[PDB]
């Protein structure tokens, strides 16, 4: 490129917005236009020791080319001698994770609204053959109007044709097919959505156990129950998303038309 490239000197850095595994995400303002955004920092030495350099590249290439109202925007990136920087769209209201600690549980209206935004977001993603694979409260942010925005494409992949073999994601959200050493596809995000919907309503993931081994066991068996306040419609939906057989889980278009979703969304 013969064009001016990004540089750290281009942004005034503000306070930290969050703590990531390989560095913090700071609020920031581009100096010439005063546009407010978020700066995700990654320390290169940490990335090298972890051997996650190829996943960083997939995060950047996949997220930067995605364009949707409920997916966090990746404007660009730049690296220097010790770290790598992602120029992200600023999410003003924080994470759904934080809102979930505060409210402890989400009522049905709030839960269906979020599921709907996320389901629309995932549908657009799949139409591009991208599988997120790390859907969870800490990766869901809130925009200026309280609208959900999917973020963190760290474990994402572009799967045009073939299935995948990677185990990746968060323990409580892992799909059975991954744990069991089987191949997987975009249906893993449908499982994540069921896990996520349950957590929104109950306040905790359905397979939470005291050890790693016990959680693997419960996911593989799809062992969980609902507290008494979870209505019939929510149970019908989560039960359909949480099918051991990936083929039997609903399409995102079905979730969006689910009676419970349309009545409360």
């Amino acid at each position: 490129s013969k064009k001016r490239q990004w540089a750290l000197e281009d942004f005034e850095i503000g306070r930290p917005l969050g703590k990531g595994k390989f560095g913090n995400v700071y609020l920031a303002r581009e100096k010439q236009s005063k546009f407010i955004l978020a700066l995700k920092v990654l320390f290169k030495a940490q990335l090298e020791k972890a051997g996650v350099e190829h996943q960083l590249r997939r995060e950047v290439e996949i997220q930067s080319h995605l364009r949707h109202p409920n997916i966090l925007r990746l404007y660009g990136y730049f690296h220097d001698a010790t770290r790598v920087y992602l120029i992200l769209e600023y999410a003003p209201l924080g994470t759904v994770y934080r809102e979930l600690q505060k409210l402890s549980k989400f009522d049905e209206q709030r839960t269906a609204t979020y599921i709907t935004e996320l389901a629309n977001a995932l549908s657009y993603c799949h139409s591009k053959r991208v599988i997120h694979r790390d859907i969870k409260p800490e990766n869901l942010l809130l925009g200026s109007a309280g609208e959900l925005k999917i973020a963190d494409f760290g474990w994402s992949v572009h799967a045009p044709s073939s299935r995948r073999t990677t185990l990746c994601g968060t323990l409580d959200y892992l799909p059975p097919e991954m744990i069991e050493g089987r191949m997987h596809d975009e249906k893993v995000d449908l499982w994540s959505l069921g896990v996520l919907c349950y957590e929104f309503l109950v306040g905790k993931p359905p397979f939470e156990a005291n050890t790693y081994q016990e959680t693997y066991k419960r996911i593989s068996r799809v062992e969980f129950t609902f507290p008494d306040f979870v209505t019939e419609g929510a149970r019908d939906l989560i039960s359909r998303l949480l099918k051991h057989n990936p083929s039997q889980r609903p399409m995102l278009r079905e979730v969006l038309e689910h009676p419970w979703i349309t009545a409360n969304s």
Binding site: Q5, F35, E53, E61, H65, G76, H158, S161
Partner: peptide, 29 residues
């Protein structure tokens, strides 16, 4: 190596990309 097929050019924030996926899926060799 930190050379990614993604944007790195300075942008003027005051003043259709997703085809990249299918176009890369359809390319041959």
């Amino acid at each position: 190596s930190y050379s990614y097929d993604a944007p790195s050019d300075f942008i003027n924030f005051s003043s259709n990309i997703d085809s990249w996926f299918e176009e890369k899926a359809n390319l041959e060799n």
